[PDB]
Write a protein that binds this ligand. Structure first.
Ligand code: ACP
Ligand code: ACP
Ligand code: MN
Ligand code: MN
Lengths: 181, 177
């Protein structure tokens, strides 16, 4: 790689943003960053900021439940949000994981049925990955050009890839793979 | 008035964009937003060609070849975004690319060649004054001048924004009722 620079050039700006977001949304969250010394193409560093911030915001908004709710639910009172970078072969892997309520998969199914994309019989045969992928279909999720869409497009314009996994009341993990320059 | 989703106009673009990019050997990720945005049905036939021209301009003149994108420290794949939405009592349509931007120096040279401006007045022209030459009838060698004419024909307005090596954004606002 030619113009390598530590991912910290983009990471160090998140602790402040996370705390303020958590305060505004009345959420209690412990933010952990890992692999801040991971080197990657400077172009990626300058472009991956917007996408990551959105995933972080998603986690704080839709993921982590208010402290009172986590308590009522029987989970540790403070939520955990982890942002990490690491090497996997010739790929830099960035992950945003929260231990929140998890993506509501039924909600997605209901929305897909409403849009006429699938019917009830078919909906019952879909796999979790199949359900979660609806989140990447442009125009699927209602807006207010932000969203999972913009995240995937930006990541893919860097020749990157993005995947999602989630478990009810367990949390959600978004994974971004960036290529070695 | 009688409305229809703007998808009637947008539907054919993905294929044309894909084929054009492939022809001019450019890597382009085409994004279309708000295809459900409605507009006057009598606008469909008229606004199609102008929009296609703006998309072609972005692919041909905007988005740079891969090696150029890399040299400039930009994402390898260029991004072309076509969007429509309702604002106030109008339909707003935008065509944006993150390419090399409009060659303003080239526009001024053309304006002088066409007798539209004396060279003694070129040094102080504002960016808007420069880009506006594109709307002067006969400026193009369908061209931007024709696009502006058609938009005016629909009682709407058009504006351009562009920054060197950053990109170009063309915004069209058409009246609803
Ligand atoms: N970390 C997370 N935990 C739980 N659900 C999540 C999540 N991240 C995303 N989601 C779910 O996925 C759906 C869409 O996220 P997306 O980022 O595309 O849209 P948005 O609903 O957040 C509105 P916008 O992106 O325009 O602010 C969300 O509305 C939510 O239901
Ligand atoms: N998205 C964009 N990015 C960069 N330059 C653009 C552009 N859209 C237009 N231009 C530039 O502005 C000048 C004029 O565009 P206009 O559409 O009026 O004419 P045209 O001469 O390009 C017709 P054609 O090239 O289709 O034969 C172009 O010649 C090009 O240099
Ligand atoms: Mn969101
Ligand atoms: Mn042209």
């Amino acid at each position: 790689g030619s113009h390598m620079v530590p991912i910290s050039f983009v990471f160090n700006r998140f602790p402040r943003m996370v705390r303020d977001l958590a305060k505004k949304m009345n959420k209690e969250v412990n933010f952990i960053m890992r692999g801040e010394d991971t080197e990657l193409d400077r172009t990626f560093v300058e472009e991956i900021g917007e996408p990551l911030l959105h995933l972080l915001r998603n986690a704080i908004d839709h993921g982590i439940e208010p402290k009172e709710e986590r308590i009522a639910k029987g989970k540790p009172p403070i939520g955990t949000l982890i942002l990490s970078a690491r090497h996997e072969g010739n790929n830099v892997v960035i992950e945003v994981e929260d231990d929140g309520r998890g993506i509501d998969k039924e909600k997605i199914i209901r929305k897909a049925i409403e849009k006429g994309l699938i019917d009830e019989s078919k909906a019952a045969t879909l796999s979790d990955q199949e359900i979660l992928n609806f989140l990447f279909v442009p125009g699927f999720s209602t807006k207010e050009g932000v969203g999972m869409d913009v995240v995937k497009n930006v990541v893919e314009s860097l020749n990157g890839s993005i995947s999602i996994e989630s478990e009810k009341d367990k949390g959600t993990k978004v994974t971004i793979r960036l290529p070695l320059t």
